[PDB]
Symmetry: C6
Subunit: 29 residues, 6 copies
């Protein structure tokens, strides 16, 4: 239902932020 | 209802973050 | 009510991230 | 109540993203 | 309960974004 | 349940943002 849909969109948000954090780390060294 | 509106806005947020992740990588 | 207020704040969050994405893309090219 | 507390924290999040978007714009000029 | 837990994580998120905004301003 | 799942994804989001904040400062 709708609460699961919210949780799934939040999981997608976490995945994009993890990619951004990865690239941050890479830039730093 | 409003729970669907919340999920739709979160989907929009995820798409914008995906774009940001791409561009940041391209700029770098 | 309160669920509508939450959706409205998420809409504001989405708009600010769209502004950031736009600038990122402008800078990139 | 807790739903109002959630909305308030989302308002704080939008404000910080607005600041970040501002700096992006400043960087672009 | 879980609604309080959600509000607390959102507070932590706002705090990290405040740090990012600060660092943004400083790096620039 | 589903509210716990939401809280857990939000915790993960806070973690990734803390990492971004940390690496930024280094840069």
């Amino acid at each position: 239902g709708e609460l699961k849909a919210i949780a799934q969109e939040l999981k997608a948000i976490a995945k994009e932020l993890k990619a951004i954090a990865y690239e941050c780390k890479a830039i730093a060294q």
